[PDB]
Amino acid sequence: DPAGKAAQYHKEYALFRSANMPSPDKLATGVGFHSFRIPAVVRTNTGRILAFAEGRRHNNRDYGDINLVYKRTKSPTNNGENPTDWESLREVVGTGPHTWGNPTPVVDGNTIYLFLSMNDGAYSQNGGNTLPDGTKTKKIDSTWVGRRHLYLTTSTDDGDTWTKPVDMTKTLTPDGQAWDAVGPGNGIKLSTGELVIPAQGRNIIGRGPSGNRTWSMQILKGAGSEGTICQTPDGKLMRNDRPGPMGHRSVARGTLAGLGPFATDNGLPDPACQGSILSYNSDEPARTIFMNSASTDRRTAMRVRISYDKDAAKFNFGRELKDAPLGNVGNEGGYSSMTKTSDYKIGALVESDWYEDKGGEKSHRCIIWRRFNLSWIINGPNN
Numbered sequence: 001d002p003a004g005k006a007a008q009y010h011k012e013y014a015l016f017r018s019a020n021m022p023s024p025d026k027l028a029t030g031v032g033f034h035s036f037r038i039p040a041v042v043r044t045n046t047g048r049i050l051a052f053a054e055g056r057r058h059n060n061r062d063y064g065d066i067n068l069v070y071k072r073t074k075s076p077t078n079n080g081e082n083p084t085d086w087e088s089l090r091e092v093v094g095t096g097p098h099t100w101g102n103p104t105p106v107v108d109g110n111t112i113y114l115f116l117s118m119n120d121g122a123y124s125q126n127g128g129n130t131l132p133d134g135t136k137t138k139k140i141d142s143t144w145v146g147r148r149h150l151y152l153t154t155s156t157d158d159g160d161t162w163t164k165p166v167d168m169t170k171t172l173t174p175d176g177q178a179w180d181a182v183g184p185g186n187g188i189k190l191s192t193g194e195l196v197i198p199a200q201g202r203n204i205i206g207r208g209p210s211g212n213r214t215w216s217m218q219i220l221k222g223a224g225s226e227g228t229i230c231q232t233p234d235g236k237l238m239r240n241d242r243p244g245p246m247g248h249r250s251v252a253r254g255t256l257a258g259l260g261p262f263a264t265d266n267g268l269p270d271p272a273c274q275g276s277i278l279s280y281n282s283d284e285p286a287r288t289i290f291m292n293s294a295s296t297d298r299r300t301a302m303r304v305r306i307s308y309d310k311d312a313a314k315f316n317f318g319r320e321l322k323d324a325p326l327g328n329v330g331n332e333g334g335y336s337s338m339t340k341t342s343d344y345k346i347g348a349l350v351e352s353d354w355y356e357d358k359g360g361e362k363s364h365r366c367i368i369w370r371r372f373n374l375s376w377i378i379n380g381p382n383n
């Protein structure tokens with residue numbers, strides 16, 4: 001790979017700073033957040049970078065009062081190089097006591113689409129969970145009030161502002177479903193112009209002129225809840241999904257007409273956690289980048305890899321993120337999201353956990369922003 005001849009570049013710092021950290025991230029209203037989880041990042045067509053997360057207000061749990069927050073690079077050209085290149089925290093949506101999350105953006109010309117999941121603030125995946133007012137949640141169910149919803153918001157001003165989210169559940173989630181997820185992480189725009197957003201059990205397909213899309217479901221058999229989508233160099237679609245059981249990623253391939261079976265990919269260990277994938281370039285040699293925790297049981301084995309295959313059948317060992325460790329952010333590992341920057345880097349958001357309460361709800365979570373070039377990957381000591 002000719003990119004391995006370049007001097008290796010990496011840089012890393014916290015981008016979403018939990019309440020316990022110095023200079024914690026707060027909205028302009030003064031609302032701060034115990035934890036940030038569930039990253040998503042995209043480069044827009046101006047070069048600006050948009051970074052999204054769940055602002056988990058009171059603890060690190062997946063339910064309760066959770067706002068979908070974001071930052072942008074201050075200019076379209078700074079590429080997120082330094083901490084001071086980023087704007088202060090902003091909010092996409094935070095209405096009510098509800099959960100707003102699962103950011104899943106896709107850039108479409110001069111429009112950025114952002115899909116997101118939602119649940120009523122009185123409900124949680126399992127039910128019976130304690131909330132800050134001393135009540136217990138109800139279990140998410142198939143009722144309109146109790147199910148997971150799917151919302152869409154857009155921006156036509158390079159992420160500066162967002163439309164009021166529109167509930168798309170009745171047309172873009174199967175009837176009768178209870179739990180749901182979109183992404184989280186990102187969707188894609190195909191070479192043939194359609195938009196594809198990964199979701200639980202299905203893809204969501206956007207068709208129409210750029211910025212004036214209408215959406216439909218592509219129902220999958222055997223897909224996961226938290227999926228990734230890619231158009232591989234052969235032009236085919238690939239789903240690479242978080243498994244139910246701990247072990248390995250679950251992968252399927254196909255087209256807009258349908259995907260083939262999902263199968264365990266024994267080349268990609270995974271501890272039942274979200275991952276991220278990125279088509280980096282289409283010119284020779286075409287590359288796909290994959291990031292997850294490369295372990296069958298822990299989230300603290302973050303690894304970024306390259307595939308040169310036209311179907312992304314095989315990835316290399318790649319490079320363990322711990323080789324460029326970041327201090328003062330807790331223990332790195334968990335969900336991730338990647339984009340390509342204008343200056344030929346990969347920009348990745350990566351979860352990190354202070355772990356003060358171990359796996360309990362009081363452990364503060366933050367999100368790291370990494371940038372690195374292909375050379376840093378290629379030249380990994382074990383690659």
Ligand SMILES: O=C(O)[C@@]1(O)C[C@H](O)[C@@H](O)[C@H]([C@H](O)[C@H](O)CO)O1
Pocket residue numbers: 001002003280281282283284285344345373374
């Ligand atoms: O590190 C990069 O990104 C590089 O500079 C060198 C790579 O070998 C080449 O594949 C790549 C590609 O030409 C552009 O990314 C446009 O897709 O450019």
Ligand SMILES: O=C(O)[C@@]1(O)C[C@H](O)[C@@H](O)[C@H]([C@H](O)[C@H](O)CO)O1
Pocket residue numbers: 038062125179181225226272273
């Ligand atoms: O860190 C996790 O594991 C998490 O709990 C965080 C997410 O907020 C949640 O939506 C998702 C979900 O619980 C699983 O995908 C099983 O449905 O996973």
Ligand SMILES: O=C(O)[C@@]1(O)C[C@H](O)[C@@H](O)[C@H]([C@H](O)[C@H](O)CO)O1
Pocket residue numbers: 271297298299300331332333334353355358359360
């Ligand atoms: O590697 C893991 O998975 C770990 O042990 C350490 C991680 O730093 C932490 O974020 C994670 C989390 O508390 C559990 O995965 C919840 O089930 O636990």
